[PDB]
Amino acid sequence: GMIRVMATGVFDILHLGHIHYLKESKKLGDELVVVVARDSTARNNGKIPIFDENSRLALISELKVVDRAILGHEGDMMKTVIEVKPDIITLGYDQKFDEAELQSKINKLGITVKIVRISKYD
Amino acid sequence: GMIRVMATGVFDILHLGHIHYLKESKKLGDELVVVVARDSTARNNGKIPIFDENSRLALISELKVVDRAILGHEGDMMKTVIEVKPDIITLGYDQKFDEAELQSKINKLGITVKIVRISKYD
Ligand SMILES: Nc1ncnc2c1ncn2[C@@H]1O[C@H](COP(=O)(O)O)[C@@H](O)[C@H]1O
DSSP states (O other), X not given: OOOEEEEEEOOSSOXXXXXXXXXXXXXXXXXXXXEEOOHHHHHTTTOOOSSOHHHHHHHHTTBTTOSEEEEOOTTOHHHHXXXXXXXXXXXXXXXXXXXXXXXXXXXXXXXXXXXXEOOOOO | OOOEEEEEEOOSSOOHHHHHHHXXXXXXXXXXXEXXXXXXXXXXXXXXXXXXXXXXXXXXXXXXXXXXXXXXXXXXXXXXXXXXXXXXXXXXXXXXXXHHHHHHHHXXXXXXXXXXXXXXXX
16 A cells, blocks of 8 residues: 555665665655665676675665665566566666566566656756 | 764765764764765865765765764864764774873863764674
8 A cells, every 4th residue: 555666776886866866766656665786687787896785785775765675686677576566667867778668578477567767867 | 852973974985884883873862963074174184085075965964864964164173063062972993092082172171972982893
């Protein structure tokens, strides 16, 4: 009985652009669940985080706007969305997903979710 | 009685050391006020921060455990203490020298303010 919003990212060096992404995400519902990329997932995207996955998760968990934070699953965003059951998934201004592709992918799993692109912080 | 705790720092790049300092400081009272160093002060103490003072302050304000955050005074700590009027001032575990120095200031003036060193972070 609440609108659950899922946001994602690496969150290596926290900065106000993150805060903008997370607050705009929280506004859309009641609960904000943040999925923090695994170090392996981050490397496979050509980033080696300065802070390890456990440290990045713990810091994100300390933010007022974050209700729950969990680690992602290496290789398997399908499973995260199945386990979180968001009503809404938010995409950062620069995140590399096509809203259409993501939607059809999620619909093939028999899940209905609203996908929203968040603005760049200025 | 609502105990006011004052913590201080630059908080340039947030990390779990900062979180342990802030979180343990909050545990000691009811309101945590964080005093964030101005860019001139940090520079003058030989630590150039990469994030500007307004950014650092704004990010610190987003932490669950922080009730209020303010910019410090350009080179005059006792002026901050006189304005914030904390019940407790929190220092890092390593800072016994700063502790003794602050204690002499307190004692000469005869104000009621308790200094507490926070436990060493792991
Ligand atoms: N400057 C910014 N403006 C808006 N959103 C941002 C900014 N910086 C990071 N984000 C978002 O925060 C999430 C995590 O970014 P990252 O830690 O770079 O993976 C992604 O959705 C980003 O688009």
